[PDB]
Design a protein around this nucleic acid. Structure first.
Ligand SMILES: [Zn+2]
Ligand SMILES: [Zn+2]
Lengths: 180, 104, 69, 111, 127, 127, 104, 180, 111, 69
RNA sequence: CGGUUGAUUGUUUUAACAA
RNA sequence: CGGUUGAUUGUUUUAACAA
């Protein structure tokens, strides 16, 4: 929950074509299924940036491995990521989800990374087939990230121009990619 | 302090909570069979843990022969200047059971 | 040469060759690509290579193909 | 058309070097870069046009090939409507005569 | 098979780090606990001992040993670190609860807060 | 070629972050500078503007704009971030030195320290 | 404040300090040739920087034609309510030169 | 300079064969050649740990790329690393040093990683041929790291048993590997 | 001796799985693991002995081969002094009859 | 078959074959390894494979080799 | 290539540096 | 496989959580 507003505004801009966002920011939260209800884990949530050789998905996988989650419990992990996972990241998340059936993953993406690339399309389709839920980050999850992961110091969320239009266009593109 | 442990207390094994239950059972069986690995039992209601370190790391026994599908644990220790015993048992399948302190 | 794409593979080869509207690959990392004309078994293809009009002819059951001027 | 099987990393390095040398370095600023959306072929990743006098050398990168999805490169000399398939060896001299490491066809095409 | 039995209080990493930093600060910077002996992890034959703090009380010593890489706890943040407190005199050792240890520390020895065993060992995830 | 000329004071990332956090804290938590308008980076046509703080002074406004991704500075930690301060009234803008800006702020407006332009813009690597 | 800049002041270009000197010269030549890239000149003795942003990002000119191997910079600006001019020149090879404020 | 003593003691133990040190810690410092003398850079020094997919060498390379070091100045970078660089790390450091001739690197290793492995031997030899200086971390650099990179809070350095013997054995092994 | 070219990552996975199954999993606890320092051959990385009745199956991993340094695997059945080179196909059945994924010779040897 | 290890390569082949005390590789990912007996051009080697005593014989200038019972 | 951005351009990648 | 450790075992990987 320590993220300056400028970084969030710059990286999570939902314009489908954004040429100067070279880093990937991934906010994550985990819920646990207890007594039939999903209780949020306050200390099992945060945000991670990207490196040129280290993507945020690998860092999140390492964090999950360190968390030592109980195998006899059901976990629901919500992601809010600026760029949709690349081929290697989607591959690794798919095999991790296949090897970890007690945890399910929902993903909201601010932008679709190489949505016109067939390789990225098959990577996203394989990630979806692995059980991951891929969604387009609309205004609601943007506000949720602002009030949850962003160190706004009480400042209200100020949406950028064309947020809803970009969200609708990205929803259409994701529906076309996933063959809904 | 003594009464809290003596009156109501239950113990469970959580050595490898990220692994499947069958693998947990196998690991616990191995660690009980050879005294080269530590075994820890956690009180459910608190953060208290009873750890059986091997004697090489420094009438107390862990055994399976008393009952099939069960592990029996006897641990004498001097607590707060008075000698006490910890008697426990956990069954193989659930890796859970009852453990409590008594005066010896 | 060899086709790159077992029963499903040969069914896909057959229906792609019969109907078209798809790309056909024949590796030797050299490979011959057959694309539909709208995008712009015996195989015969005229092609200009290094200034000469060579013709590549071959057969596939795997198979054999060669280019001759 | 002759397509050589190439890894995606080499394609990315090729396109990055080409963009660098036509935009920042400006050593190959006379070249043209055609993106995916300007090509009717759905399998074409990109096109690089190298002006060679009146003629032009077109390097076309393809994605989504079923060779499991593969990528490829095709080199083609073009004199107006006339076209010809070109091996990397001829393209090396054709680029060196009229023109980060320099973008070389041989390094990208070689296996 | 011969075993050694020790009562270990499971404590998260943050509290272990806070305890270590407070003890080291009060050993060298604010030398109130200057008589405490801090034996490192490589001086113990136990492979799962992270740190060991010796507090001389008269002719005896209160030893607080923090362990790392233990078995996972029931709670989320009990990842394998714990603390065990004992009192030894002339090769006679008895395990001591954190409250009694803090009482002994305040009897014999007693801004950054003073190092207290009760705060280190208290379970904030079970209450 | 038409150019726009602005005097930008090169300041390291830490001071930029401290200034932004102090301004936002004094805008919402300790509402002394509650009249200050904080316009984000996407509301400016300049691609290299990180933040923009508007401070109303009478009928005019003092604009402090922080830039990111600029050219590297001579010093080690001048990595491409800077601050430029100007005063605008009725579409008439004049660049203002940090000392005069702080004087205006204290004239019109005046624990976490209060946001001062002089501390933000001062070069601690050249002295 | 004005006197510090007017009396003694020298400027230099440090746009890409991690790149070789020839690449720096080429980049500076390109950025001066087309008005699509910013150029920054840093005072050696302070953290002050003069940035020539393109007019699309919001009698001031940057030019090479006055002297071969040199870049001449004229920047009028209203500072502290008084209009002043910034006149500078840097040579191509060293990416260094003299720049100072004057009254216009 | 924020490193707890327990981590340093556990990871930088110089026993040639150490089976349970799965993480690599790398402390780095940079000096600049000004007026013929090497002045230390106070803010360009620190320490980085390792990830299963991200080695400390790659993180240091990213840090160097972000530092924007002047190309017209000479830099001397000192490393203190618990494990000697692996094949990929030595490869990448060698090519980086070849592509960056204005910076020289000296490396002190607490332990030699796979010193019996021919692949690791050729990796170390290639790194040495690239211009990097590889040395065995003796008591002096251990004390320097304790007083510089370790958050000891004024506590004196306490060497472990057999530090000098292990240092001599590792020096002999490194001399054999480098073919001095 | 027949040696199959293998990447170092596959060798590492093979040795990790073997160590796991003889120490932690104990499914293959009867196996033996000979390290580099117990072998006279400088090129031998490791040896895995799988007891098969009276006979034993030896899987030897080699490093430092000049095939630029390469690694290899050799499978060899041993009946006392008698020895025989074994293909992975026979070793699959030989392991399955008498005995993380299971350590399979075919997966490591296959290219 | 082909040797894996140009003038320096053939000189190394020659002196390694003449003196010994080194390993010789011949790839086909199958490869034949020739190790010195202390560790335990025409090529001939008796070897037991799948229970039969096959003999591998070949020549290298690249070359050709085959195994016969 | 800060643009009808087609996205590894000069990365904008950082919990307290003024508590 | 916490051991005459041959090193991807159950990682020991964290600047303030008690300022
Ligand atoms: Zn990715
Ligand atoms: Zn490494």
């Amino acid at each position: 929950g320590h993220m300056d507003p400028d970084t969030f505004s710059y990286n999570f801009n939902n314009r489908p074509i954004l040429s100067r966002r070279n880093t990937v920011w991934l906010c994550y939260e985990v819920e646990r299924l207890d007594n039939g209800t999903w209780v949020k884990m306050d200390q099992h949530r945060g945000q991670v940036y990207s490196e040129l050789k280290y993507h945020p998905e690998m860092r999140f996988l390492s964090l999950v491995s360190k968390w030592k989650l109980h195998r006899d419990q059901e976990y629901e992990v919500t992601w809010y990521i600026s760029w949709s996972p690349c081929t290697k990241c989607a591959r690794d998340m798919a095999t991790f989800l296949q090897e970890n059936t007690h945890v399910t993953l929902t993903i909201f993406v601010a932008r679709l990374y190489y949505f016109w690339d067939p390789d990225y399309q098959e990577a996203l389709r394989s990630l979806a087939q692995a059980g991951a839920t891929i969604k387009i980050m609309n205004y609601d999850e943007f506000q949720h990230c602002w009030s949850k992961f962003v160190y706004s110091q009480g400042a209200p969320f100020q949406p950028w121009d064309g947020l809803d239009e970009y969200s609708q266009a990205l929803s259409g593109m994701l529906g076309e990619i996933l063959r809904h | 302090f003594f009464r809290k442990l003596s009156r109501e207390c239950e113990i469970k094994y959580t050595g490898f909570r990220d692994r499947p239950h069958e693998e947990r059972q196998a690991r616990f069986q191995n660690a009980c069979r050879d005294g080269r690995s530590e075994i820890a039992f956690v009180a459910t209601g608190t953060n208290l843990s009873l750890q059986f370190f091997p004697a090489s790391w420094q009438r107390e026994y862990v055994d399976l022969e008393r009952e099939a599908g069960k592990v029996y644990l006897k641990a004498p220790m001097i607590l707060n200047g008075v000698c006490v015993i910890w008697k426990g048992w956990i069954d193989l399948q659930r890796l859970d059971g009852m453990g409590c302190l008594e005066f010896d | 040469i060899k086709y790159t794409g077992h029963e499903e593979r040969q069914a896909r080869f057959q229906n792609a060759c019969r109907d078209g509207r798809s790309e056909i690959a024949f590796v030797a990392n050299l490979s011959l690509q057959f694309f539909p004309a709208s995008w712009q078994v015996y195989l015969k293809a005229p092609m200009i290579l290094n200034g000469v009009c060579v013709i590549w002819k071959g057969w596939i059951d795997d198979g054999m193909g060669c280019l001759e001027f | 058309m002759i397509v050589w099987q190439v890894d995606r990393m080499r394609i990315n390095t090729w396109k990055r070097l080409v963009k660098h040398h036509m935009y920042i370095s400006r050593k190959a600023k006379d070249w043209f870069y055609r993106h995916h959306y300007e090509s009717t072929n759905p399998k074409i990743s990109s096109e690089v046009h190298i002006p060679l006098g009146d003629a032009k050398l077109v390097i076309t990168t393809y994605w989504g090939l079923h060779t499991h999805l593969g990528q490829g490169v095709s080199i083609e000399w073009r004199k107006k409507r006339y076209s010809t398939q070109v091996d990397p060896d001829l393209a090396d001299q054709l680029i060196h005569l009229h023109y980060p490491p320099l973008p070389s066809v041989r390094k990208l095409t070689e296996d």
